[PDB]
Amino acid sequence: RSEQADYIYQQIYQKLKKEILSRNLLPHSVPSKRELAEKVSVNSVNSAYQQLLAEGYLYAKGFFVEELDMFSLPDDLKEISDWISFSHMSSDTDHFPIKSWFRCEQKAASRHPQGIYEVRAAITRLISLTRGVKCRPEQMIIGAGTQVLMQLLTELLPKEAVYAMEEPGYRRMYQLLKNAGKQVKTIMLDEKGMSIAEITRQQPDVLVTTPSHQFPSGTIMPVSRRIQLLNWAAEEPRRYIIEDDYDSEFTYDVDSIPALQSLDRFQNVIYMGTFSKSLLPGLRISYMVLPPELLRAYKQRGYDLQTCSSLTQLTLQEFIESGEYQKHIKKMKQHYKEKRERLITALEAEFSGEVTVKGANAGLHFVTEFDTRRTEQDILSHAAGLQLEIFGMSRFNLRPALIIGFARLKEEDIQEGVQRLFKAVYGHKK
């Protein structure tokens, strides 16, 4: 009567449901609305009956019961700290100017499947100046992360396309391609990156490459190799190059290197870019630039829906157009440059010449080889059991070596983290 939790019409229709289900109120067999009403309003019983009648528990004495057929988590799946992390995955709530982001969002509220046009135009403007990427906003597709866009691209590309990826390379993308039923050839690297020698031997249709900063090996692909790939694609129709530009704004000794696509004169390179390592933690905004022919193939689908929220897009635009973004990148560049030096100094201290640091002075990771003893597994297990998040290089197969990411590493925890690493590398006692 108090109607706490549920109103009276809800309590009556819930009971009638339950009693219809248990068969206590048998098929085709109910009181008049007034009859049931006559210690509750007719309004209540009308509401109940309406419910029951909309749902199929009753049929239009008064009304009649429907006649419904009778009806014909494991511990290990449940979800269960003070960790230091050398993970290459994402960055951190470091020195992200979050107050300015919110301001831009505020402002953005005051102020299309491929993403909003003005946002696309804001991104296109940026990458022309920052990457030498040549495109019209019509060519850009925005997406909630690169994986969403890579899925779409595998559909826009021809169905039997043979993909070739870098070995070692980005395992996550190899998995996506593998899942999508594609044949994926793997191409070893030489000192210049993805080998055009083996791209010639094995014959693929679609290369996947990280020429600004090879993932994971950290090598920058020199222009001589870039031209060689660009020429290989330009002969024979239906050869494509997916350029995975995941970290190219961060180069510490030189200006960012113009994108592979900037040298393409034959519209064979699909430029894939991302803000996922540049904005707030947990936000994934990526984009890709389709050559005319693939934009057409997208155009003729027409059923795709945009994965980034409108307000997130507009916030990004405001961030870019206010100048806050360029300002942000410039500070972060300076902070990572220093965090990298500091990390490498600590590594040089603890390991001396027993560590070899590999890869370019760029991005948010490098590679680290160690003068033997233990297997990759030994180190990982040892490190796992010390609250240090680390990944071995063998993960990127498609003397033990690890990838060391420093994006989501706090500067305070560098020394402790390196010592934990040393402990892991050489498995010591107490």
Add this chain to the structure above:
Amino acid sequence: TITLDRSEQADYIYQQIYQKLKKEILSRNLLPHSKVPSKRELAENLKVSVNSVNSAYQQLLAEGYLYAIERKGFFVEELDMFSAALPDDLKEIHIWISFSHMDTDHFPIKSWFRCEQKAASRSYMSHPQGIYEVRAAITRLISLTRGVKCRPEQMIIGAGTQVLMQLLTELLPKEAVYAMEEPGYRRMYQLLKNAGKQVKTIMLDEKGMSIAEITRQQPDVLVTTPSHQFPSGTIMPVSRRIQLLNWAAEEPRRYIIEDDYDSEFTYDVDSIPALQSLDRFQNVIYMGTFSKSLLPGLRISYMVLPPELLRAYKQRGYDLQTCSSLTQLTLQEFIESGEYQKHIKKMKQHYKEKRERLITALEAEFSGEVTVKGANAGLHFVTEDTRRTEQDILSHAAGLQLEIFGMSRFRPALIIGFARLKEEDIQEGVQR
């Protein structure tokens, strides 16, 4: 000769030097392996700092336009080359009364931002499935609103229903045979098709998705819209619901995907408990969404996985969450503060009124085509005596500044939506 700006605009001296040198190397003006001046030689002959020349050469060297040899100097790298406008139809004409089924106002954007500020202060990737506490919040809500029974571990949040559906088809058996309502949600049909899946089509009767037809064809996975069939807004009676559930329970490896897209909006009765609330055998995959009930262009959706499809998901380990952590946390706060449910009640009434108004206006100017098929729920209904070919009514409508869609896409019929149509502009809309 290298001309410099000196005005220093567009480009620093070092950038101008490396740009010019890149050009002369590329256009074979410098020829492979020839030496380039000492740093000091070039800095004096150009009348600039040696620093500038140094930065310029350091660029050249990192990118492979030059190479070094100790003591000897810097040389032009040897490079090959090949010799092998956007089409007008791909141009984007960025320039009407909408009766589209796919609400910019009425949303309490200020409470949203308050929840955002509240979330950003308490907190600040996190988890492939979505943040745990966000899943827990959604799980509580749908228990109460939908009768859905699950633990947050079974939940996968996604940036819209397409991303979740794509993932689901990788979790399900590879050769699984799907079955869809006919007519149905075309977008979802294309996706299934694009994944190379066999998809059977199942006709409707007065009770929605035909169990007889399901029995005939023998699919493994149903896709159904039992709260409000899309497009023909038939509410699947509990009689038929029970039939589909028994089917899935009879035989292993049968699944029901419940696409719940608008169930929070029923105007004459309480929202109807999910098909999945009545399932006892964990065979229904509940797919829900906030997409028709939040900020205009925000897509957050979620699916609830039977423990075995969860298992398969956990055996992958490489999927990354598509909804931003900050938005998820905002949604959580928004939900837990009561603001969400508060906003749903207001919208329901506002949609109730606008719908009653819309048909009032629809019949007062028709009574010839005024057959309004579909139920008193959700955000769309149907309209089908005279008329020309279906494609024609769509043609004149385009001219008459009127976004309207034809049922053939899912005697001529039109689907009409009213979520994005102002109270102000109804009478003119009908007139057209």
